[PDB]
Design a protein around this ligand. Structure first.
Ligand SMILES: O=C(O)CNC(=O)C(=O)O
Ligand SMILES: [Mg+2]
Ligand code: NI
Ligand SMILES: [Zn+2]
Length: 331
């Protein structure tokens, strides 16, 4: 069995190996990368996502989200307070303001300490989930707007044609902006490219150990757990590395820098935070190995998780028993 300790693997594909995306995901898995739940891919030196980032300031963040925390430093939830629209140029200025900028620090480890110590006492503003792409249409390799669609994958594997589309999302972050512990919708893969700016630190639980995280989370958020049997789908709960270590939950951490891809694998729980102003792009995708995860994915039917149009068909085809209850939670 490859990668039995479930370490995060880092890959350095050549330009020739960067041509066929599906093939390279399958290669990574042949080496055990999926056991970690997350892998880093450093593109070949010849590659670029686009020529420059000099002309992105007029992109609109229609609903910036202020991330307000409640709880204790290592175990907290966050809710998202909607703010007035602002452009990327306005947002970058805000990120770099004295109120929101990254503090002085020695290294990534120092900054991580400061994050876990102080995150709850501030409410950073995140431009998340903005439909769009920053890949140049002429970038042919690992262009997140040109991947094979999940609907076509389900059709190729299972023979059923379904409605729905699959497009990428932009994330504009600042210091302390936070992504709560989650797996992807329907336990899909995700891929995330850090286009520009300051790093993003990730934490991940090996898929084979996801239920240990879930058990801890039920203990640590006992009201939430009573309200919904899949409340991590709400994407609001944070648990620090110190707390996970105290409770024996297996996990790993890595920092992504600008120009690097991260891939999350089915049922790989992940969480993290941004170091300062940045812009990432991410999209879900599927492979044949995903299908069995899709069939077994938990679902939130309490009404909180509310998700895209395209998840309908996945639930309907892969989880017909669950469909009626899940759809009620959609409506
Ligand atoms: O970058 C973020 O805020 C969150 N991204 C992801 O959870 C992902 O790419 O799967
Ligand atoms: Mg612009
Ligand atoms: Ni994710
Ligand atoms: Zn729920």
């Amino acid at each position: 069995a490859q990668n039995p300790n479930c370490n995060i693997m880092i890959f350095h594909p050549t330009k020739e190996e960067f041509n066929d995306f599906d093939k390279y995901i399958a290669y990574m898995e042949s080496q055990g990368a999926h056991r970690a739940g997350l892998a880093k891919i450093i593109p070949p030196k010849e590659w670029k996502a686009r020529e420059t980032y000099d002309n992105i300031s007029e992109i609109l963040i229609a609903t910036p989200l202020q991330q307000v925390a409640s709880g204790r430093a290592g175990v907290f939830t966050q809710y998202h307070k909607k703010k007035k629209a602002m452009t990327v140029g306005e947002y970058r200025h805000l990120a770099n303001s004295k109120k929101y900028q990254t503090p002085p620090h020695q290294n990534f480890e120092d900054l991580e300490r400061k994050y876990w110590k102080n995150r709850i006492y501030n409410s950073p503003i995140y431009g998340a989930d903005i439909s769009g792409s920053l890949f140049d249409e002429n970038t042919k390799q690992w262009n997140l707007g040109h991947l094979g669609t999940i609907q076509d994958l389900l059709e190729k594997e299972c023979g059923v044609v379904i409605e729905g589309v699959n497009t990428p999302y932009l994330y504009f972050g600042m210091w302390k902006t936070t992504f709560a512990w989650h797996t992807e919708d329907m336990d899909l893969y995700s891929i995330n490219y850090l286009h520009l700016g300051e790093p993003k630190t990730w934490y991940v639980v090996p898929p084979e150990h996801g239920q240990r995280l879930e058990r801890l989370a039920r203990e640590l958020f006992p009201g939430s757990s009573r309200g919904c049997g899949a409340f991590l789908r709400h994407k609001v709960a944070l648990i620090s590395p110190t707390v996970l270590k105290e409770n024996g939950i297996p996990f790993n951490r890595i920092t992504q820098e600008a120009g690097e891809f991260m891939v999350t694998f089915p049922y790989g729980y992940h969480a993290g935070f941004n170091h300062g102003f940045n812009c990432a792009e991410a999209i879900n995708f599927a492979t044949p190995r995903w299908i069995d995860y899709g069939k077994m994915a938990s679902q939130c039917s309490c009404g909180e998780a509310r998700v895209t149009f395209s998840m309908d068909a996945f639930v309907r085809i892969l989880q017909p028993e669950r469909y009626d209850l899940w759809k009620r939670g959609q409506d």
